[PDB]
Design a protein around this motif. Structure first.
Motif, mmCIF file in Angstrom:
data_model
loop_
_atom_site.group_PDB
_atom_site.id
_atom_site.type_symbol
_atom_site.label_atom_id
_atom_site.label_comp_id
_atom_site.label_asym_id
_atom_site.label_seq_id
_atom_site.Cartn_x
_atom_site.Cartn_y
_atom_site.Cartn_z
ATOM 1 N N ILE A 23 0.767 -1.123 0.105
ATOM 2 C CA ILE A 23 -0.024 -0.001 -0.123
ATOM 3 C C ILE A 23 0.688 1.233 0.022
ATOM 4 C CG2 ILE A 23 -2.012 -1.021 1.212
ATOM 5 C CD1 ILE A 23 -1.123 0.082 3.685
ATOM 6 N N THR A 24 0.086 2.153 -0.512
ATOM 7 C CA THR A 24 1.221 3.648 -0.769
ATOM 8 C C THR A 24 0.993 4.087 0.537
ATOM 9 O OG1 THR A 24 -0.437 4.980 -1.430
ATOM 10 C CG2 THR A 24 0.421 3.792 -2.834
ATOM 11 N N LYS A 25 2.223 5.220 0.920
ATOM 12 C CA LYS A 25 2.081 5.652 2.123
ATOM 13 C C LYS A 25 0.864 6.508 2.759
ATOM 14 C CE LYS A 25 6.284 8.063 1.298
ATOM 15 N NZ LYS A 25 7.470 8.185 0.986
ATOM 16 N N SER A 26 0.173 6.993 1.600
ATOM 17 C CA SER A 26 -1.057 7.915 1.654
ATOM 18 C C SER A 26 -2.173 6.951 2.218
ATOM 19 C CB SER A 26 -1.631 8.518 0.465
ATOM 20 O OG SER A 26 -0.746 9.556 0.117
ATOM 21 N N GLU A 27 -2.434 5.747 1.670
ATOM 22 C CA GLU A 27 -3.356 4.834 2.133
ATOM 23 C C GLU A 27 -3.077 4.204 3.493
ATOM 24 O OE1 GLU A 27 -2.337 2.393 -1.695
ATOM 25 O OE2 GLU A 27 -4.670 2.717 -1.609
ATOM 26 N N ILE A 53 6.023 7.441 -5.986
ATOM 27 C CA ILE A 53 7.033 7.701 -6.923
ATOM 28 C C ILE A 53 8.220 8.188 -6.059
ATOM 29 C CG2 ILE A 53 7.526 9.900 -8.165
ATOM 30 C CD1 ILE A 53 5.588 8.255 -9.822
ATOM 31 N N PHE A 54 9.211 7.939 -6.881
ATOM 32 C CA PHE A 54 10.623 8.257 -6.464
ATOM 33 C C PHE A 54 11.279 9.279 -7.027
ATOM 34 C CE2 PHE A 54 15.316 7.462 -6.265
ATOM 35 C CZ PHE A 54 15.521 7.715 -4.817
ATOM 36 N N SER A 55 11.736 10.393 -6.373
ATOM 37 C CA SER A 55 12.065 11.786 -7.145
ATOM 38 C C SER A 55 13.293 11.624 -7.834
ATOM 39 C CB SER A 55 12.207 12.846 -5.941
ATOM 40 O OG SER A 55 11.950 13.894 -6.476
ATOM 41 N N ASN A 56 14.247 10.942 -6.947
ATOM 42 C CA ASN A 56 15.543 10.634 -7.975
ATOM 43 C C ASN A 56 16.362 12.093 -8.255
ATOM 44 O OD1 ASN A 56 17.504 9.458 -9.408
ATOM 45 N ND2 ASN A 56 16.677 9.331 -11.224
ATOM 46 N N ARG A 57 16.219 12.801 -7.019
ATOM 47 C CA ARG A 57 16.647 14.318 -7.184
ATOM 48 C C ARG A 57 18.043 14.232 -7.481
ATOM 49 N N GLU A 58 18.827 13.306 -6.896
ATOM 50 C CA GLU A 58 20.443 13.242 -6.845
ATOM 51 C C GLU A 58 20.743 12.433 -8.209
ATOM 52 O OE1 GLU A 58 21.590 11.146 -3.259
ATOM 53 O OE2 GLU A 58 20.436 12.556 -1.892
ATOM 54 N N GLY A 59 19.714 12.192 -8.939
ATOM 55 C CA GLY A 59 19.714 11.821 -10.359
ATOM 56 C C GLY A 59 20.795 10.585 -10.235
ATOM 57 N N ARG A 67 10.562 8.673 -18.299
ATOM 58 C CA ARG A 67 10.737 7.385 -17.605
ATOM 59 C C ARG A 67 10.453 7.783 -15.888
ATOM 60 N NH1 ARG A 67 16.312 4.862 -17.706
ATOM 61 N NH2 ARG A 67 15.437 3.509 -18.975
ATOM 62 N N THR A 68 9.458 7.430 -15.490
ATOM 63 C CA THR A 68 9.126 7.489 -13.854
ATOM 64 C C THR A 68 9.785 6.362 -13.126
ATOM 65 O OG1 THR A 68 7.164 8.670 -14.095
ATOM 66 C CG2 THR A 68 7.001 7.075 -12.437
ATOM 67 N N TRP A 69 10.300 6.715 -11.889
ATOM 68 C CA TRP A 69 10.672 5.740 -10.890
ATOM 69 C C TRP A 69 9.664 5.649 -9.565
ATOM 70 C CZ3 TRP A 69 14.397 2.563 -11.888
ATOM 71 C CH2 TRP A 69 15.282 2.825 -12.842
ATOM 72 N N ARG A 70 9.347 4.431 -9.172
ATOM 73 C CA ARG A 70 8.558 4.282 -7.955
ATOM 74 C C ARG A 70 9.319 3.449 -6.950
ATOM 75 N NH1 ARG A 70 3.220 5.677 -8.386
ATOM 76 N NH2 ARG A 70 2.709 6.351 -10.536
ATOM 77 N N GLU A 71 9.015 3.413 -5.813
ATOM 78 C CA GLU A 71 9.652 2.482 -5.075
ATOM 79 C C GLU A 71 8.887 1.723 -3.952
ATOM 80 O OE1 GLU A 71 10.611 4.104 -1.031
ATOM 81 O OE2 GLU A 71 10.282 6.168 -1.529
ATOM 82 N N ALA A 72 9.379 0.641 -3.314
ATOM 83 C CA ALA A 72 8.603 -0.161 -2.484
ATOM 84 C C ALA A 72 9.510 -0.935 -1.538
ATOM 85 C CB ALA A 72 7.992 -1.391 -3.030
ATOM 86 N N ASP A 73 9.149 -0.897 -0.256
ATOM 87 C CA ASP A 73 9.767 -1.550 0.990
ATOM 88 C C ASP A 73 10.217 -3.062 0.602
ATOM 89 O OD1 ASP A 73 9.415 1.122 1.788
ATOM 90 O OD2 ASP A 73 9.050 0.237 3.794
ATOM 91 N N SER A 89 11.316 1.157 -12.572
ATOM 92 C CA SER A 89 10.902 2.248 -13.569
ATOM 93 C C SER A 89 9.726 1.934 -14.458
ATOM 94 C CB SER A 89 12.151 2.550 -14.683
ATOM 95 O OG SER A 89 12.199 1.474 -15.290
ATOM 96 N N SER A 90 9.139 2.824 -14.997
ATOM 97 C CA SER A 90 8.033 2.363 -15.883
ATOM 98 C C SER A 90 8.467 1.433 -17.283
ATOM 99 C CB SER A 90 7.322 3.656 -16.208
ATOM 100 O OG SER A 90 8.166 4.533 -16.979
ATOM 101 N N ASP A 91 9.533 1.354 -17.502
ATOM 102 C CA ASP A 91 10.101 0.496 -18.293
ATOM 103 C C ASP A 91 10.690 -0.717 -17.825
ATOM 104 O OD1 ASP A 91 12.154 2.390 -17.917
ATOM 105 O OD2 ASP A 91 12.922 2.181 -19.823
#
Length: 108
Positions: A23-27, A53-59, A67-73, A89-91
């Motif tokens: 489940i997402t953090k929001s849920e 979604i994972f920001s990948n700020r530090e690239g 391309r979108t990045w997500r994460e999971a525990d 990633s979405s790919d």
């Protein structure tokens, strides 16, 4: 419940979604999870946080057009969250981190 690096990585590439113990953090928040109290297992037993979604700020993760990045525990069972995450990633590139998003290595 599927919450291992290999189990989850294979599920994602195959079915293109997280297994349903996630489940997402929001849920989780909406169900009474309080991160500071480590109580996810009491309010959502057998669930893990994932799908945000994972920001990948530090690239650090490879970037691409659309391309979108997500994460999971990973490896979570109860208590405070651990430092293990799968990044996908979405790919359907799959990376892991075991040090709180400091270092990443490819696993699929």
């Amino acid at each position: 419940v599927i919450n291992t690096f290999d189990g989850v990585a294979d599920y994602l590439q195959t079915y293109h979604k997280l297994p349903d113990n996630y489940i997402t953090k929001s849920e989780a928040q909406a169900l009474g999870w309080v991160a500071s109290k480590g109580n996810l297992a009491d309010v959502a037993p057998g669930k893990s946080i994932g799908g945000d979604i994972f920001s990948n700020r530090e690239g650090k993760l490879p970037g691409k057009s659309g391309r979108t990045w997500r994460e999971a525990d990973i490896n979570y069972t109860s208590g405070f969250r651990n430092s293990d995450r799968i990044l996908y990633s979405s790919d359907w590139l799959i990376y892991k981190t075991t040090d709180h998003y400091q270092t990443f290595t490819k696993i699929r």
